[PDB]
Amino acid sequence: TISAADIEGAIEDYVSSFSADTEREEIGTVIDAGDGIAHVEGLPSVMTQELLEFPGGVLGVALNLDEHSVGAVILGEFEKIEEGQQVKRTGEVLSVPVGDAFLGRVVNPLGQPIDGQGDIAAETRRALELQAPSVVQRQSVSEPLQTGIKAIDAMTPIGRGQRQLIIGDRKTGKTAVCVDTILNQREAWLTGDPKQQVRCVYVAIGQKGTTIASVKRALEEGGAMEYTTIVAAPASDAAGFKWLAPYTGSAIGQHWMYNGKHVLIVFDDLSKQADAYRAISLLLRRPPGREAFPGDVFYLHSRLLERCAKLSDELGGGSMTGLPIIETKANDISAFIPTNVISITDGQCFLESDLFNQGVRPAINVGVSVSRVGGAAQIKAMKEVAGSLRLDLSQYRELEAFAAFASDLDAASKAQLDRGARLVELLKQPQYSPLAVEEQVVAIFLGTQGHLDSVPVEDVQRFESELLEHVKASHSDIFDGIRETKKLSEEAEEKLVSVINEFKKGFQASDGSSVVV
Amino acid sequence: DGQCFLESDLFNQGVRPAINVGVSVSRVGGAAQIKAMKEVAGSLRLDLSQ
Amino acid sequence: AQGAQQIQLMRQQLIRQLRTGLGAEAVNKAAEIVRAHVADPQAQSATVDRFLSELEQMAPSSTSRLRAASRQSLAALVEKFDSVAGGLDADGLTNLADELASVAKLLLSETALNKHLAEPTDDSAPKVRLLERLLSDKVSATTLDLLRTAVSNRWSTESNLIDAVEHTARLALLKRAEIAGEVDEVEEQLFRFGRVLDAEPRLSALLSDYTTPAEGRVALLDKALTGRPGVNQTAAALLSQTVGLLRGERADEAVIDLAELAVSRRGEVVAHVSAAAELSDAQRTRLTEVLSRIYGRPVSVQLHVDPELLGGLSITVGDEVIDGSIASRLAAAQTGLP
Amino acid sequence: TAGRVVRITGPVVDVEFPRGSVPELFNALHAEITFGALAKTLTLEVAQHLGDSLVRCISMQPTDGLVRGVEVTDTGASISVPVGDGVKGHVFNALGDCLDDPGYGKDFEHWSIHRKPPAFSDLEPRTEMLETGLKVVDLLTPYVRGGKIALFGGAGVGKTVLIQEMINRIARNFGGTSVFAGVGERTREGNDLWVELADANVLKDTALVFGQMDEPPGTRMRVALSALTMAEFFRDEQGQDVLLFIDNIFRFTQAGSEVSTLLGRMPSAVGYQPTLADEMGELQERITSTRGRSITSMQAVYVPADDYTDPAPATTFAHLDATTELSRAVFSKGIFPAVDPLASSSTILDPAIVGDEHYRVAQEVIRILQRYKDLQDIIAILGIDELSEEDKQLVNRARRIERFLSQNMMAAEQFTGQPGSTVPLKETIEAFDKLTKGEFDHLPEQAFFLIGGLDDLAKKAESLGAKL
Amino acid sequence: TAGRVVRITGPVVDVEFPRGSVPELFNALHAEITFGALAKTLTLEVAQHLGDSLVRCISMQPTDGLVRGVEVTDTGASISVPVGDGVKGHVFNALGDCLDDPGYGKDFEHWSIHRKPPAFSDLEPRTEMLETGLKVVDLLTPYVRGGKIALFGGAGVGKTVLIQEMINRIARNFGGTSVFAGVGERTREGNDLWVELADANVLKDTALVFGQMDEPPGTRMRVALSALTMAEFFRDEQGQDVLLFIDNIFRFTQAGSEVSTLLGRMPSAVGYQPTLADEMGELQERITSTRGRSITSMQAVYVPADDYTDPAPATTFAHLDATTELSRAVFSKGIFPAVDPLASSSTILDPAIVGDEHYRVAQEVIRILQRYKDLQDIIAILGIDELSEEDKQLVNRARRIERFLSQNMMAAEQFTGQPGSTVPLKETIEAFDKLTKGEFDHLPEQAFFLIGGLDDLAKKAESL
Amino acid sequence: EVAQTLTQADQQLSAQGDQVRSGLESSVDGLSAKLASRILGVDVNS
């Protein structure tokens, strides 16, 4: 029922209100151009990092300023640049629109929608290079950010305002972990309380377009597009777009954060951004260093990642949580960019191909993964249940060499071996299935209280799942108590124990045995 | 179109020519052999690799 | 719900497509309408008048390649030339310009001499002794003193020294023009020659090359461009001298620089104005006054008609342009439509 | 209004033009080499505007015999290649000239080889299996119809043999059009493929575009674009399913790196051009299926020096839906195809798409092979007899599984004399389920080497003195 | 006499000054970014004299929004930080600006951060021991007065509590002060340290200087010198013992490498700056004892790739006098401080320095602990009863020794009401000599937890 | 069901868009003249 009235009114309002009164403009000339870099003479009053307009609506960013000319990174359609073209200065450094209308949209590093869903109504504009919150503008990270992944939420917990690196080889399950976190934020979104809601920003750098589409489909299937924005800089985009995409996502998240909201931003992945920045720097003839990177690549990533902060109560108490992704080659965490990002972040989740092939999914290496925030980012129940996990798993890894000599081992060593095997089975989790904090608490309680000791290892997973189902269908009061009080009360604990024993009476091992007692 | 890899370790062992059978290959294969040789040496390289 | 969202989104997309098509058709129709409107030259005059009124409303506001040492030394040399030329006669000015051009060509030829005269050194008296032993009496007193001053000061690069000498020569000739009271004619001729050279790349390329003999190139310029009957003598002499002393600078660019220097000699600012058609005397006075007010300094307007303007004016001063072009308005309309 | 050559250095040529006649970037220019022995017409692609009306260009043909100051003509457009149904059944070079019939296709529609990729809103994930009949590929690295598939490997591990095998299995019974892009590969291989397609009767449905490793770097840079332009025409205009084969896509990157330093670009890490990722991204993002328009692309990716951490393959990995990684170790063990089952991957290998049974069997196979890889060093030093009984069982199972992943291929007969075989997906899943349970532990491992399905296994075991 | 910006390349800025007004090397120049969003005052540090009145400088702040030709003002002196007792209890950056109170200290005496080490004749030729009062450190890894102590430890090992304890002990026992230098400091961690020190009430005795991660490499390079200058004022003008904390020194080295790369210098081996050793020596030689006063430094050291032969740790360890390794294994046992007695070491645990009795007792303790570590595997797998009787005796003695190395720290009083203890060196030596002889093997294990000398041991023994 | 609804809605929208394109062709002249007058700066009915 498209009426021509709206089209006519819109075009009439455009034309009638169209005024292009002449304004004095500083203009330079393109003196040379090559592979995404244009050198432009003139523009004496241009600012460093200013945005420049080239004919045909092409955009550049002034990076190299010298007496002879200005070096400009072309943000797209570089083939349209020609020697002699007139370049205008916009008088503005890079900035992006920001507002609540960006939720559920896919935009490019300039904030322009690329999902084909029309315009985005911008609340305001934010410069990409605004300073991060100062040392005295923050408060200690204390609120948990539940990823829904038991391994992370128990071993390397993430708090709101924390920067947790996700580092590993390709195809180790990093994007899966980040997408699981974003999906897990859905219940908090449905709560409707801004103190619990988490707005998600997924920044895709260098990924092929179909991969970004697959990620968007995964988010939609879980209803995460309602509170998620995607900043996309696919592999076909200019190096400038790949360099700027994390800053655009950070600017949107910062607009939300400074208004008292809590934001989760994923950078997938910063290695591609570093490569794009290196390409730009080399094409600008800036001196190279190790791995040919410029002398400010660490500055690049550190300035990006220090904007993720937990703001003080004076500034609204908002927060932005960073989940940068780093792809290692042959698990070389000693490489330049992995070293920088590891030094920058507050904790690391190391994913490994060998663990993944062993069936340990998510393939997080609990031995080396760390979270410096630690228990401050956990609820009391998780702190209590997960206290012994680290030492138990370390002892299990120590004892694994004696798997076949269990008879020779004394009672304590054999018990530790069995407990560790069951705990490793417990930390396994299927993809696209985050768990609520109460369910994670109950599962870890099963693991660490010996209630899986009688269950065969090969059945542990199934047992857990079924048990978590059973409670959710008949004893949800346990989950409700955990969620409301954030601790496992003694009465709730004993009720859970009785429920576990009855369910064990009801459960069947895959080998036809009995799991009772 | 293929390579004959020669190793000093094989040479010192008495394998002369010291052709490393596993990583040495001809990209033309049986087309470069007479029928009798192709018949008697069809799977010799794979057999020696195994 | 996802399906309903998709249906609504496709409806909105079709609405957007219709909007874009309607806007494009409207822009084309308006372009034809304005093209018809500018058929009458009175329409062009009216558009220029409106743009000049806008400029009158527009609020006012406020060589660079030389490095520090070279720029300071050239400043000293030009000040010395100004002091020398306090009362110099026109014939003396012509002779001084010719002698300075000869010295510049000599420095170009004697690469070792130029390098030894250009190497920075704190002391200057030995340089003066060398210069005197070279051409103490061959040239007049004024030229010898000017060369002494030039070699005294410090030059960031060797080439700059030659440039300095050439600059002096130009100034001398311009001074002669000032004495002749014909600087307007020389400026007009220089701008005309620069414009024709810019529009004639082949002659500019042939004249710009420095490998061919200088005398032959000057003769070619004379029998081709500057030997015509209706040419100012002073402008022709200046152009011939600069082409004979070209170190590699492009001929059209060199002529434009010469015209810029000639106008700057009066303190004016050269404003390049593109128009749809030639302006009137009242329009020219209005434009000159308004440009001077906007930039404060007096402005000399070099009108350059172009038919694609369709109206208004496109003014360029320094590195800053005011684009009253109607074509620019059409481009804005064609790029601003949703 | 014509330019002139100013500087010549290898394949890079500087050309000076008059004011306002500087050709746009990527424009094709023409120059003459008049020396009798090497007389020809150079096609130069404008690569950079150097300023002062100078342009740096890459020569598409060898510059031997080129003279400074010769006239350079601007065509006003990029390199363009013929498009249409007429290109099917013919062999072209990077410039669109018909090799097997010179002058053919000159009257066809011509498309510029430089083109923007599909808009993001037009992109659609593909999650449909493309059954091949190869056990390892079908089980552990299932290919995607309409998706991007790559074969990674070092020199001489079987990338080309597997490409020919997939042409035999997929293209032979393909309804739509096929495009093969020989990019910086052996001319002998190109001739062999041409003859093989002619004999198989697949040539009539195939467009071949060859730029060989003997060509200058510019041809190796642009031949992939030419073939992709033909494939893009088939996808967008004719609206039919397209099979695209590229061998070897790494040669595009290698030629780019070859000319990078002569173009004045400061080298990046490992001697590659600074623009490696951006150029590869443009080219790869053009190779894709849009909504309703399917291109199934299979690319051979050379891994320099077997180093999978090399920036070229590392950057290429991000552009694939499925990757079959060939290993030198597997090759040297005599296992063909030399697929590394632990390093290869596929995006559709999840229970939702392939089903619970397929996923579980594949994961069990991967787990067993990973454990065997872990135990190999211990077996080498201390011997198998020092392993636990369960580990001995797993080692035997893993050896049998790794042998059974090998297969006699149709394209491998020329190398072994054994005719190839094809295994249905259901049979593969059942056989590997049986293997992972130790149902064939009693058979010798040699019985599992280079065979097809379970019937072949039984026959070979009987020939070796054992009963399946 | 003011300059002007000519070239801008990231944090590298070229400035042209009049002929006779070129600033000296390392002079601080001021420029203005007037763009509203990014308005600020850039501090540039003159790095090179390029000739023709051009200088090349490193911007201490991001140069986004800077325009060519803007006026550049020479301050006439290098970066200068405020000094005096007024800097205690406040947080500063590498440029001397107070972060918790902008403008504070702008009127104090200001000292240039580039200073020479003490004259060769003014150096103390004889090494001295810094009696901290902690049993483990004093006995096994004595700290050198005016020396350098590397600190190793992951998260959740007590490193922050150890730093607070050292602040307490230098302020109380030595009547000194502390300067914390957060090099490459994470802003979250800097804020956490600020609040923690304020809560523990030791902030009044500490001056915090933060060069944050999100700042260009220049400030991360110069923050260590700034903190060292404050400490040097405390040592030389106030005649106080100073304890300087550097975290992380490797980040200082890496910032130096980044600056060297930005200036176009050709990298040395493994990509480090050619002057790596020179920079490290310039920083470290200023930390010494002189005229009876000293600056003792405890520096967190990062070892790339865990490769101790890497040029950065290799150059750093040329100046370190002691090493303290904090281990999660010790921490889990409840032993505080969680110093690994076997991994930690000191270069002055030599009879010629600490005395023969001290060395003998320390060696006996180390031997017992090493044998216990060796028997740990048998204990864990085969069981304790599997061991011989002598092995059981040594296990008991080693357990008592290792629990006795724990101490009730002053910083721990904020967690448990019990205050801290200071064990004199002689008391520690004699107590551990008695313990190694097995004269307390009959006492309960818990009696050796978190106590001071022998009097506390007896008091807790009677309590059990 | 979603696919069937999508195709039917696509056909309906295409038909409606054809109708709207036919309808809107009358008012382009007036708004184009208004745009020309605005850019020219003089109100011209033409």
Ligand SMILES: Nc1ncnc2c1ncn2[C@@H]1O[C@H](COP(=O)(O)OP(=O)(O)OP(=O)(O)O)[C@@H](O)[C@H]1O
């Ligand atoms: N918890 C999990 N359980 C099972 N499979 C998983 C799990 N997490 C990820 N996967 C699978 O592992 C493969 C790699 O996952 P993912 O793409 O998230 O990894 P990545 O490291 O981000 O990869 P890439 O290098 O392609 O960016 C995919 O098949 C994904 O389905």
Ligand SMILES: Nc1ncnc2c1ncn2[C@@H]1O[C@H](COP(=O)(O)OP(=O)(O)O)[C@@H](O)[C@H]1O
């Ligand atoms: N399936 C196979 N069976 C037997 N031999 C093979 C097989 N695949 C490859 N080979 C051998 O390995 C060589 C390398 O194969 P090819 O793919 O042509 O090289 P590349 O791997 O470098 O592309 C072949 O020439 C052939 O001799």
Ligand SMILES: Nc1ncnc2c1ncn2[C@@H]1O[C@H](COP(=O)(O)OP(=O)(O)O)[C@@H](O)[C@H]1O
């Ligand atoms: N001596 C001690 N007594 C009581 N608690 C301690 C002691 N040492 C450390 N802790 C506890 O251990 C934790 C260590 O954290 P922190 O001091 O930040 O060091 P790190 O940075 O190594 O984690 C602290 O939260 C503290 O409560």
Ligand SMILES: [Mg+2]
């Ligand atoms: Mg990923």
Ligand SMILES: [Mg+2]
């Ligand atoms: Mg090949």
